Amino acid sequence: MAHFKEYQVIGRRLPTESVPEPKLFRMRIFASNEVIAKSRYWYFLQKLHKVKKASGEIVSINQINEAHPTKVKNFGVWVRYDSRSGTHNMYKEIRDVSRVAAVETLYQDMAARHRARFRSIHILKVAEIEKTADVKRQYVKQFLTKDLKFPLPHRVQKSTKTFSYKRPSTFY
Amino acid sequence: REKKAEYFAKLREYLEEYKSLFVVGVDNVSSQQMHEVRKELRGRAVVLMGKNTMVRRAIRGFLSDLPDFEKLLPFVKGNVGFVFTNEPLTEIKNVIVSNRVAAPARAGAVAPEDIWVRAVNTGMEPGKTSFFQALGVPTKIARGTIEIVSDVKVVDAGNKVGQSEASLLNLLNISPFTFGLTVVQVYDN
Amino acid sequence: TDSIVKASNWRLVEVGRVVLIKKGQSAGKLAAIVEIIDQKKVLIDGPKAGVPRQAINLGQVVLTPLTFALPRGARTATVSKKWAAAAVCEKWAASSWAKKIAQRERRAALTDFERFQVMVLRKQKRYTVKKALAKA
Amino acid sequence: SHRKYEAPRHGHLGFLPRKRAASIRARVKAFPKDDRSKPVALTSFLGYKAGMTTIVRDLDRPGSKFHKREVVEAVTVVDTPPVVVVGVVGYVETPR
Amino acid sequence: IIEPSLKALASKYNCDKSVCRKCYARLPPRATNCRKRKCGHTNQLRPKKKLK
Amino acid sequence: ARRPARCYRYQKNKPYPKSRYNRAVPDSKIRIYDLGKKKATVDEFPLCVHLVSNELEQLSSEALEAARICANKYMTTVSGRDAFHLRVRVHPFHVLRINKGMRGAWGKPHGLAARVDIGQIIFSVRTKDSNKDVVVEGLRRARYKFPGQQKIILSKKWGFTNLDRPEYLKKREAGEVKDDGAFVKFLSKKGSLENNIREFPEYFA
Amino acid sequence: MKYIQTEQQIEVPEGVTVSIKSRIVKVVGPRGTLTKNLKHIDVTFTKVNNQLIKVAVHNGGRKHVAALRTVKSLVDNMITGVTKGYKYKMRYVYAHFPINVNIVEKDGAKFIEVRNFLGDKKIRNVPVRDGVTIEFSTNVKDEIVLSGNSVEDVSQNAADLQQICRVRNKDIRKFLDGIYVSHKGFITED
RNA sequence: AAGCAGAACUGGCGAUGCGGGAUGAACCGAACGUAGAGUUAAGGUGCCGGAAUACACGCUCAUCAGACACCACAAAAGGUGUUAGUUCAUCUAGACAGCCGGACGGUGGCCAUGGAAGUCGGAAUCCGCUAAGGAGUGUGUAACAACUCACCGGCCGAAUGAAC
RNA sequence: GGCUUGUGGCAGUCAAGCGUUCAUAGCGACAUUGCUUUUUGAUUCUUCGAUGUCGGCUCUUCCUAUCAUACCGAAGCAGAAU
Ligand SMILES: [Mg+2]
Ligand SMILES: [Mg+2]
Ligand SMILES: [Mg+2]
Ligand SMILES: [Mg+2]
Ligand SMILES: [Mg+2]
Ligand SMILES: [Mg+2]
Ligand SMILES: [Mg+2]
Ligand SMILES: [Mg+2]
């Protein structure tokens, strides 16, 4: 799960005599495999509808590849998480090349800054900020500057040898 | 922006009806002095003030119909106000400049000239002597009142007035500077 | 009588900066920076060397002193045509960095007969150099 | 529990161990700091304790109630015949 | 001779200060938090008590 | 003189009320449960602010009495006596015991505590929107008298009723709301029509 | 937040030459020279047009960006002190015991002595830092003026003379005696 | 309350070594004939010490850091330390800061006071003028006076403030 | 001796009030969070083929929750004394 995978999961109640063709609820789920994606789908239908895995069926599961995985996209993510003392709604912005790598960045950032796990995080929405000046966070907006050029000072070079004979520099 | 909504309409409501505008300065004069200018002139001339960029944005949003208000565009500068009148210039000038001497000098201001106290009978009770004694002013009692011995200068030119040494100036009622309503510009069509 | 400030020139993470990929599947190929994801992540495109258009970490990539004109977000065809217009591969091969890379791979490609020949030729050159040291 | 009553320590811990000296001639463990502008001189001398006696002298101590008054004081006499120089030793400085 | 201007000069350094309500530190008179770590940089301050 | 509240903080025992099997409980320290303008109409005080516990624990009656006094004192000092209706929403029914070897160690009644739960309302105030900050500050000053963690929550209901502000409004321009002493009674679509005409006559227009 | 680029601006007047090595600044103007080692900062200096010098931080946090404005102010204090100088004016405050302040020479050390401070038989002495010129002003009673090229040494020397005349075991709200700083300005300002 | 006393179900120790938890009857893993080879569990891979000073995103600087499943401790309350976020409000129709100007008249508002004139206090808290100025934000006086603030206006020149 | 900390002892948070005026100079009710093991309870894990028992004397060392001394900050600190 070095990469997340985004799946669409379509499920429904079992058809009955009184109610045939149930309503075919569909969700977009981020998971590492189809087993977790189906598990997260039934977890959210337990939060939304009177249905479970025994009273419902999975009619389709498909992997959604990213439409343009080679372009850089500003993302707005709406997320709900549990802290140690309550539940909080949070909006974050990630400048990233795909949706699954932005969800990876969000989970890494949420665990780093709030000590919140995958167990305790609900992804409410991942959307593309299609134009500039709808970007709200300064840490994403600072990369939207025209012809952005920055250096990387203090380059640290990893040697394959225990001993060095040169007193290495950190030029760059 | 609600107060600006009526202020812009009132500003055009005085630009289009009053034929003479008079740009007047305001530096050290009080609300009391604006109140007495109101009471000295109700009906002859109108004082509209509240200098801001409200005025500049209003007049440059009114240059659509009259391009003769662009002369006023550079002149809105300094703590300033407008006077809307129809009466002659050398009469409205005289009525708004005739009232100069306002409330006495405030402690901690820079007195331009040198302030000095003369060797003449002051005219208050001899109990108010520690004010003269604090500055070193020589003092004798004549006919039961303070008379000064010599013409001593209490502060020199280009110096701040002290908080301790503005008290005998307040008692003696010498205030070399408060100034009145000065004017900066005249507007005619 | 003059202000003297040391400029301390640095390689910049910029659009059009040619980079060498030192870790991964490419591992010594050349790519160009097309976008900047964040402080440590960029987007690279190496179509002349066969590098895929990918978002990469700047840690596993070393910047080269070469740069060329490239618009922001240029696609693979645009990156290919402006790479050949700027002639990046010739300017890369002229550098002593790439000369040293080619020298160390030729030394690793030397066989035992060739290492005997280079030792014989090193002795032949050494005799002339030591002779010229004594004359000078 | 505590002493219930506290008294100073019996003896000085900075003179430990109370053992015999390694030689009869006690060693000078520190010398005065060298002022190089002064002429060359000896910093120490060797003598033999002969004995003690008393003196009488006038005390010059202003403020003391025995100012300008005679005091009886014990003095120790050290017999110091002139020492013979027989050698010289040089000392280099080391990180050890 | 008290020279109230010189008295006001010495009151700026000795009298016109603040006091931390926890660690008793003498502080700048319009400070918000005490500068001392041992009180936790608390915002509980008070004016220095004026003489008479 | 009293054993500290750390010995009776958590719901360790089963609920132990005053009953015919206990019969010797001392009186609670909190006796007044409605304060301020308790005769106000429902339309008078639309805003509701709650002090809600975040922990499963026990609140002693002395803590409930002390928090009532300090909250009511602050809101009376700032906004006045009649600007609010403070209702406390927990009652100290559980009886705490004290055992003053371990033979025959069953305890005698020591005091009264209110067993609370996560999300349970401790204090409720209904007031106008004018003094939302006064009520919030009074509730958070009463927060200091309680153990555990408490929260200040602005209710989206109208007053002490169970309807939201827009839902009670829609019922109020219609005739389906009639007033009472301090609460209101709502018209239903059930029952005798003769009664449903006698009360709520402004409806059926 | 790791701001990508944060930079501050240093203006160099005509008589000022500013040579900076790695982090050793040397500023020479009409009044003198001033050197300072900023090796604890980790910033980057660039010269633009011989009258304007930028200093930049790349990828800096809150504390590291906050140090950047400090460095620009310290270099600006260098230029201010090398074309205008620094002049600290201090007044003697006492009630009964007059403070006697003079300049003395022991082994050529240039000390400031303070006698009769609150009637103390102890003589207080503070050294005068090198590059600090001490004068006692005329036509103002009880005034000492400290001037020099460096605001750091002028203010520390003025603060040393202020702190050497502190009152112990007394109400300092009442006993206001001491030499206090009353003005901070420049030498060649007219 | 207890490494306290007493029950229910199950699993253990006792009766049992082995790998791990430095150490330990009960914890984790796994139960054991003698060996060889391989792969693992729990636990780990700077050095002690076998095994990456691995890769990646962040957070933290402690003049008592932290690295504790059982387990060998820490709480309420706080911090413009720093990080991330929620809500509300203001701002180029020149927002927040700093400095500069003015902060009035009825009126020393009605009472109550020994006296309280905006500032011991009770109840009210209205319009006149203005851009604006409270029947007062503080310091003061016995009461005055005086100084100060809210409120607005000179200046720049871009975002800011508050509660969480 | 070990566990616990009701009780004892020592701290803290809030701030109705005291302090002529003023919550916090100094205190501080109603509540409430803690620490310690120099009290006393509670336990009965070690010791009953014995660990000599209270106090005092003597002597050493340690802790800080500091009475004095050193240097400081605050006060309803004028000095002095606190
Ligand atoms: Mg003792
Ligand atoms: Mg129980
Ligand atoms: Mg004293
Ligand atoms: Mg047995
Ligand atoms: Mg083992
Ligand atoms: Mg362990
Ligand atoms: Mg190893
Ligand atoms: Mg024995």
CATH number at residue G118: 3.90.930.12
Q: Are residues G10 and G98 in the same domain?
A: no
Coil, strand or helix at A80: strand
> How far apart are the C-alpha atoms of F96 and F99, rounded to whole Å?
10
Is the same domain home to G58 and G149?
no
Name the burial class of residue D3, with classes exposed (0-12), middle (13-18) and buried (19+) by CB atoms within 10 angstroms of its CB.
exposed
Nearest residue in chain A measured CA to CA from C74:
A71
G148 and G169 co-located in one domain: yes
What spacing in Å lies between the alpha carbon of D10 and ligand 1's midpoint?
17
Interhelix angle B53-62/B2-15, rounded to 10 degrees, is 60
Write down which residue in G85, G107, G124 finishes a domain: G85
Q: What is the DSSP letter of A163?
A: -
Domain end: G85, G114, G147, which one? G85
G126 and G46, same structural domain? no
CB contact under 8 A, G20 and C7: no
Contact E6 G91 (CB under 8 A): yes
Q: 3-state SS of A101-146?
A: HHHHHHHHHHHHHHCCCHHHEEEEEEEECCCCCCCCCHHHHCCCCC
3-class secondary structure, C85: helix
CATH number for the domain that contains residue C17 = 2.30.30.30
Transcribe A25-68 into DSSP letters. EEEEEEESSHHHHHHHHHHHHHHHSS--SSSEEEEEEEE---S-
Cα-to-chain-centroid distance, residue B57: 27
Structural domain ending residue among the three candidates G85, G105, G122: G85
Could you tell me if G111 and G170 lie in one domain?
yes
Whether residues F149 and A86 touch (CB distance < 8 A) is answered with: no
Which helix or strand (DSSP H or E) is residue F61 part of?
helix F61-79
Give me the domain span that covers residue C76.
12-94
Co-location of G81 and G107 in the same domain: no
3-state SS assignment for residue F66: helix
Q: How far is CA B153 from CA B113, B138, B165, B167, D82, in A?
A: 11, 12, 12, 15, 86
Burial of F109 (0-12, 13-18, 19+ CB in 10 A): middle
The DSSP output letter for F203 is S
Query: Phi and psi of B120, rounded to 5°?
Result: -120, 150
Three-state SS letters, chain G: CCEEEEEEEEECCCCCEEEECCCEEEEECCCCEEEEECCCCCCEEEECCCCEEEEEEEEECHHHHHHHHHHHHHHHHHHHHHHCCEEEEEEEECCCCCCEEEEECCCCCCEEEEECCCCCCCCEEEECCCCEEEEECCCCCCEEEEEECCHHHHHHHHHHHHHCCCCCCCCCCCCCCEEEEEEEECCCCC
Dist. CA F1–CA F120, nearest whole Å: 30
Element (H, E) at C44: strand C41-46
Do residues G97 and G188 both lie within one domain? yes
d(CA E24, CA E36): 10
A143 touches chain C (CB under 8 A): yes
G71 and G149 belong to one structural domain: no
| CA dist D92 → D37, D95, F17 (Å) | 21, 10, 92
Picking from B72, B87, B73, B85, the residue whose alpha carbon sits closest to that of residue B20 is: B85
Q: Report yes or no: G74 and G66 within 8 Å, Cβ to Cβ.
A: no
G95 shares a domain with G53: no
The DSSP bridge pattern shows strands C4-5 and G17-20 to be parallel
H or E stretch covering B34: helix B31-40
| Residues whose CB falls within 8 Å of the CB of residue C55, separated by 6 or more in sequence, listed in order | A72, A96, A97, A101, C35, C37, C41, C42, C43, C44
Minimum Cα–Cα distance from F148: chain A residue: A85
Q: Is the CB of E25 under 7 A from strand I?
A: yes
Size of interface A-F (CB pairs under 8 A): 4
A-chain residues near F54 (CB < 8 A): 85-86
Instruction: Enumerate residues 20 to 49 of chain C having a beta carbon within 8 A of any beta carbon in chain A.
Output: 35-39, 43
Same-domain check for residues G90 and G135:
yes
Q: Which of residues 85-114 of F touch strand I (CB under 7 A)?
A: 101-103
Residue F155 structure tokens = 């209710």
- With residue F98 as reference, give the H or E element that holds it: strand F94-98
G5 contact A CB<8A:
yes
Residue D5 beta carbon within 7 A of nucleic strand I: yes
Q: Which helix (H) or strand (E) holds F53?
A: strand F47-53
**Claim to verify: residue G135 and residue G161 sit in the same structural domain:** yes
Chain E 30-49 residues whose Cβ is under 7 Å from strand I: 44, 46, 48-49
* Å: B37 CA to H30 C1': 102
Distances (CA, A) of A53 to A41, A43, A44, A62, A123: 10, 9, 11, 18, 21
Going along F116-195, which residue ranges are E strands?
121-127, 150-155, 177-179, 184-186
Q: Which amino acid belongs to residue A34?
A: E
Q: Do B81 and B48 touch, CB atoms closer than 8 A?
A: yes
F172 beta carbon < 7 A from strand I? no
Q: Are residues G129 and G73 part of one domain?
A: no
Experimental method: cryo-EM
The residues of G between 157 and 186 with beta carbon within 7 Å of nucleic strand I are 166, 168-175
Which is it for strands E45-47 and F94-98: parallel, antiparallel or unpaired? unpaired
G65 to chain A nearest CA, in Å? 15
C1' of nucleotide I44: residue with nearest CA? F101
Give the CA diameter of chain A.
84
* Cα–Cα distance, A8 to G20 (Å, whole number): 61
How many domains does one find in chain G?
2
Single-letter amino acid code for the residue at G60: G
Angle (CA) F54-F56-F61 rounded to 5° is 95
Local structure of residue B72 (DSSP, 8 states): H
Residue in chain C closest to A71 (alpha carbons) equals: C73
CB–CB contact G4 A151 (8 Å): no
Resolution (A): 2.6
Domain that residue G44 falls in: 1-85
Structure letter (DSSP) for residue F145:
G
From the list F157, F162, F155, F126, the residue with the least C-alpha distance to F39 is: F126
